[PDB]
Amino acid sequence: ALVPMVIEQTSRGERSFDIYSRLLKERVIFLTGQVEDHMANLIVAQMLFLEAENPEKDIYLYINSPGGVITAGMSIYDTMQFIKPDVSTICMGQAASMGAFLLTAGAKGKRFCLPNSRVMIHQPLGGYQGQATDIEIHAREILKVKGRMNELMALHTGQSLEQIERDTERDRFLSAPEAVEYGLVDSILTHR
Amino acid sequence: ALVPMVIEQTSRGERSFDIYSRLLKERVIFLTGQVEDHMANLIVAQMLFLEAENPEKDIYLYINSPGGVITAGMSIYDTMQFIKPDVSTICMGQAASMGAFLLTAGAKGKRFCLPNSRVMIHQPLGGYQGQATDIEIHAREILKVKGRMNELMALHTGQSLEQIERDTERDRFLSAPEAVEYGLVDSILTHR
Amino acid sequence: ALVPMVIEQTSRGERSFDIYSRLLKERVIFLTGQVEDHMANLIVAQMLFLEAENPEKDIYLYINSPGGVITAGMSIYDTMQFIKPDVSTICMGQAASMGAFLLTAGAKGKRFCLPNSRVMIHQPLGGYQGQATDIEIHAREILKVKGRMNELMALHTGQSLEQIERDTERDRFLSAPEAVEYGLVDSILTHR
Amino acid sequence: ALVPMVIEQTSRGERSFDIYSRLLKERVIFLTGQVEDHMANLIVAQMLFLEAENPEKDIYLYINSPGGVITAGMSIYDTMQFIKPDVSTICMGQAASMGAFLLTAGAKGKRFCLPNSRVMIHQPLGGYQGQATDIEIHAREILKVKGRMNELMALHTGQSLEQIERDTERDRFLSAPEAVEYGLVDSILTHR
Amino acid sequence: ALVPMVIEQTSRGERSFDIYSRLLKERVIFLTGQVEDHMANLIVAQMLFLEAENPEKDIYLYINSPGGVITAGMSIYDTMQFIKPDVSTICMGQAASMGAFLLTAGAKGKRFCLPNSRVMIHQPLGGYQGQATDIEIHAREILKVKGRMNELMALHTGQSLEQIERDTERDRFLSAPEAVEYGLVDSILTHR
Amino acid sequence: ALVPMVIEQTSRGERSFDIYSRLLKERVIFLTGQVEDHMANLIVAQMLFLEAENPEKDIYLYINSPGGVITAGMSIYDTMQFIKPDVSTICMGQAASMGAFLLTAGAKGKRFCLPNSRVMIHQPLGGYQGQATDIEIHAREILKVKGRMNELMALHTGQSLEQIERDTERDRFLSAPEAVEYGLVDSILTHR
Amino acid sequence: ALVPMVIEQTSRGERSFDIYSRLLKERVIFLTGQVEDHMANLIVAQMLFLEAENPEKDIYLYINSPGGVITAGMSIYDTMQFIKPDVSTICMGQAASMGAFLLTAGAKGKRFCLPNSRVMIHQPLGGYQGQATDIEIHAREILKVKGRMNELMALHTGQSLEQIERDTERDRFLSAPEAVEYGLVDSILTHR
Amino acid sequence: HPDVFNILLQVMDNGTLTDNNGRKADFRNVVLVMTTNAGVRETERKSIGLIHQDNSTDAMEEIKKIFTPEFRNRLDNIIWFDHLSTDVIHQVVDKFIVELQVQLDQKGVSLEVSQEARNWLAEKGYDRAMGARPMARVIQDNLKKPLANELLFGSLVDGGQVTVALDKEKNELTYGF
């Protein structure tokens, strides 16, 4: 219907998958749209299946995301760091601090971004309504989460923790060359 | 469509399941999103089928849930405690007092949580509108439910009942090491 | 998609049902969520098919319901009482006076409830707006329905009619042991 | 998905229908929910197919309906009266003057109702807004429709036309024994 | 799912259509609900296919419609008048001036209506908002459409044009015998 | 489901398409409802496939449309004018200046309309809100579009450009004979 | 259903795809409607699959789009520029600065537009609400994006950067000949 | 199966076939005939729509795409058969009647059949969907059965003569000695 079907021949010459399944068969996983619980769960299932299928062959994660929930993103990140094969993240379109976090979270030397992609990083958002004690609890929790995210980004990009802390105070927009120089990605895919 | 299909070969080399069914075939059950009646019923059906299929092999329950209805969660919990094979709960993402309850409800020694997961525990919520007598009835019922949940958590985590009662008065956020030390989980999955 | 598929082998080794159909094949019927006309009609169709398939083998009705329309519930109840095989009702989660009615309506000696289930019973609700004559008609009808329900419950549980009438005046919450002692269920399922 | 699938063996042992189609194969038609144009059209199509399949074998119409449009009900009624095989109507749950009309419209001697069913009969409802002339036209039409319905009910139940006219002035609730004595149904299904 | 499936045997004994396709295979077309562009287009496609399949065998159009757009109805009417085989219209339920127009538009001698059907005829409705010139244009157009419809009805029913013009000034409700005497239908289907 | 399936035999006698695909196989394309981007894209894809399948056999476009976006209609028109086989447009129901434009855009001598169809032509609609400069730009653009449409209609119908300009100033309703005499269509389909 | 199915014969003569998949098999990709993340991701997946299938054969991108998000469009553009085979863009209907950007982004000498297509170009839109510092950040970012888009358009069309900057200050509507002369497309498709 | 066509390829092209012992069969003096009904159903119906298309270029011409063009390229010609006309039907009925007369003269029972009886037999078993196939069953059921009764029971022995004519009043046949 809305999604196309493809044909490929191995033995009988009769294989019709949706194009997303066909690309998954080639170890290509798409992370598009907002990051939430069910989408992240699907990405985690795909990565687990690809790791169990062939622990030696890389996994390619195509990132085009305006961000999302920090929790679901941390699930994808932990599954990326846990599995054996190297996961290479390619940023097409945009990556807004969560697509961006997962982009910098790729295997070192294999994090690419297309020349016209846009990368943004910022401190996490949140909030709570209630009594002063619960407000304090949730504020301490969100501060701890922000600190943990800053630590992880300073680890993955090579920048000092204070530099990341000063840079992610507000929205920082980075083009492909600025992202390469900053340390988020390793190189830019230009041509075949 | 939105969900991918996979290919695996046993006899004829022709097996196309949605990736969730493929993972269920490997005794992997996903508990994601809010906990409600239909989702819990589906989880219970999956666990019953897996138990009837092979009562000796473990079941892996991947928990990423912001909580949900206490009743549906208690159904999943009773089905976990009833069946013969050991059910191992892995907390990826978050577990907000119901994902958390079911996480601590796993088989002892087999409750894991990923290093960047977040666990929260709190007393149950509820309410009622009506006459004073019905208000009293429903308040006594919710207090009994809170007491039962505190008893079950103090049993599963090893902490004293008074300690659980004092800790779950407000939202208590626990990271992976704090959850391990607290007794909710047994260890942290780091790498292969 | 949202519902998983399973594989079982009898002759050709090629059988893919949704997990609910696979469990129905084992004479297991799920009654979850609110009780309304279409859900009750589906349950009745399932019970009729299972009775016509093998009139000697029991039917297992898993009840997790916050109640529902009295009429649809009475349809399920009449179909349960009519068919030949014994229908055994297992209460997982909750049963709010209609799940509870159908739970007590199971075959005597085969009504079980899980140890952490919650059972509530109460007089039926209703209402009408209009002229005084129609108000009187509908009030007499709802009173007759309440009396019939009290008679049926006093029959199925063994308690005296006056005891049921005094108990169901307000919401009565019963845990698993209190439900067993009261007569709603016969025993508690604990382990294999 | 929401509807289950069943398996039955005739020649190859490979037959998977939705349970409603499986019951239709046994000449069982379900009339549930409100009566409207599309539902009545589906019922008429089912009855025509069953009549063309085997004009000698009865058709079983399971009625659980809170009423509906008089027109669609009259279509079902005319199709019931036209076809050759006897259609037997079983009232499970309720029948509110249209389910009730179609219930009394079954083949004489084959109209059953379950012991806890509820039957209601009343004059038809309607209305119109506009000029006085159109109001008069539509009022005369609805009066003619009410008279025709009273005539048909007095024919099918055996009661005198004046008795039906006096009884259906307001909502008349009839239980199973009162419906049997009144003449709406012929007997009560109790057990196998 | 909501629509049933049927089984019929010609050569291999393996034919599962939705019941509507099975009835279409017997040259039975259902016109139910409101008349709009897509429903009329589907009816026209069905009639074209049935005409191309066997130009000598009749087509049975079951009409249950509260009316609809004049344009879509005129498309169905032109396709009925154009094709070679005789189309016989059976009015079950109701026919409100468009179902009624198409009912009287059937092949002469083959227009039947069930004994409890209701037929209504009236002048077409419409309207327009805008400048006085466009109001005049659209009013002249709707008057021409009304005149054309009156001419076609006076042709198909045998009544004089002035009689149709005087009768369709307001809603005229006709039962089955009054419709037969008026000339809309030729006879009443009573029994096999 | 809502759409029927058909059976046709060429070699194995096993071919089940939706009736729309079956008619497309006979080089019959349906243009119904409003004209928008996705519907026009589907029509263009169908016409391209039919042209590539057999560039010598005509394509029949059945038009029943209340109009639509000028742009999408111009896409269909350009694809009609580009491909090799003659496309014959049949107007059933109505054609409101875009269905009408595409109807007059058919192959000369092969543009038919059913005797009770209605054809309307009018100048294009539009609008814009913003600064005076952008208002002027969009007004000049819509005037150029209106001029281009008038030129194309004067070319396809044979009427002079000034006559089309004076006629399409307001809504001009044309019946089948008036459309034939005007030059929009070539003849009227009456019978086989 | 809403989408048609087609039949083509290579070896067994049994191939039923939705018409969109059939056209994709011929290296034809449709870009219709608004440009957003998921549609652009689907287009990118299709282009990657077509490139991996045959890196030497061209890809035909049919553009009918009122514009969309700049980010998703830049993803499609980068994937077009990256892959090996030449992608030829055909503008049918309209192209509003993003369809237009991707149209001018086709392979040089292979960018066609139909004679009645409409092309519009304009500076990108956007906005932000918040503190003055964040307003300044987002304004600088949108200005950089506008500059990058102007540079890319001046590169692909051959016009000087200042000319593009002066032309895209407001909405510039270009017909097919004006688009050819401007440099957006290379020629106009007229006939076979 | 489509894979026997692969043998038929070399059978028609080189006129030689080798069995598992390496011996070659010589097909040069052998006539290769293949019967089929491929394009029949593809053309037996008219077009769907308000305007009837030609539907004649598919005149069993679409037997291509079914016969692997390298196979059709070595056929001498694809000889299409048409449905039997009413005159052809009459001639076939006469042929069957002559055959029956020969079989009866083999037992010394000469048969005489009226021309109107022949035409009734023709119009009775006349069919275009099945050609002259149901004609054999029609003629058998109409003539052979009463004749078989007469010949086997003994009332008709060697030397008898049989006549038959149409009963136009009730649409039946005549039978006698």
mmCIF file of C-alpha atoms in Angstrom, chain F residues 8-11 22-23 26-28 57 60 62 90 92 112 114 189 192, chain H residues 38 41-42 44-55 57 65-66:
data_model
loop_
_atom_site.group_PDB
_atom_site.id
_atom_site.type_symbol
_atom_site.label_atom_id
_atom_site.label_comp_id
_atom_site.label_asym_id
_atom_site.label_seq_id
_atom_site.Cartn_x
_atom_site.Cartn_y
_atom_site.Cartn_z
ATOM 1 C CA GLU F 8 -11.492 -14.403 -14.215
ATOM 2 C CA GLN F 9 -9.826 -17.314 -16.001
ATOM 3 C CA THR F 10 -7.008 -17.102 -18.533
ATOM 4 C CA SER F 11 -4.611 -20.001 -17.945
ATOM 5 C CA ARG F 22 -10.048 -5.765 -12.893
ATOM 6 C CA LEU F 23 -11.434 -2.753 -14.745
ATOM 7 C CA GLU F 26 -9.437 -3.541 -19.351
ATOM 8 C CA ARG F 27 -7.893 -0.053 -19.750
ATOM 9 C CA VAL F 28 -10.630 1.659 -17.719
ATOM 10 C CA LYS F 57 -5.080 0.561 -27.396
ATOM 11 C CA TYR F 60 -11.110 5.076 -21.008
ATOM 12 C CA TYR F 62 -14.605 7.788 -16.409
ATOM 13 C CA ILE F 90 -16.669 9.587 -20.443
ATOM 14 C CA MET F 92 -20.891 10.171 -15.794
ATOM 15 C CA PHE F 112 -18.587 11.136 -24.625
ATOM 16 C CA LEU F 114 -24.017 10.187 -20.565
ATOM 17 C CA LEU F 189 -23.756 7.349 -25.063
ATOM 18 C CA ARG F 192 -25.334 -0.726 -26.519
ATOM 19 C CA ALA H 38 -4.485 -21.812 -24.849
ATOM 20 C CA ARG H 41 -10.635 -18.272 -22.508
ATOM 21 C CA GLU H 42 -8.564 -15.126 -23.083
ATOM 22 C CA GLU H 44 -14.244 -15.767 -25.070
ATOM 23 C CA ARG H 45 -15.640 -12.642 -23.365
ATOM 24 C CA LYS H 46 -16.245 -9.049 -24.404
ATOM 25 C CA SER H 47 -14.653 -5.969 -22.890
ATOM 26 C CA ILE H 48 -15.825 -4.379 -19.645
ATOM 27 C CA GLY H 49 -17.027 -0.817 -20.034
ATOM 28 C CA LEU H 50 -19.374 1.535 -21.806
ATOM 29 C CA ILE H 51 -17.290 1.384 -25.004
ATOM 30 C CA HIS H 52 -16.480 -2.033 -26.417
ATOM 31 C CA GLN H 53 -12.855 -2.403 -27.438
ATOM 32 C CA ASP H 54 -11.625 -4.584 -30.275
ATOM 33 C CA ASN H 55 -10.523 -7.522 -28.080
ATOM 34 C CA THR H 57 -5.774 -8.755 -31.414
ATOM 35 C CA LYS H 65 4.241 -15.422 -23.285
ATOM 36 C CA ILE H 66 3.158 -19.030 -22.685
#
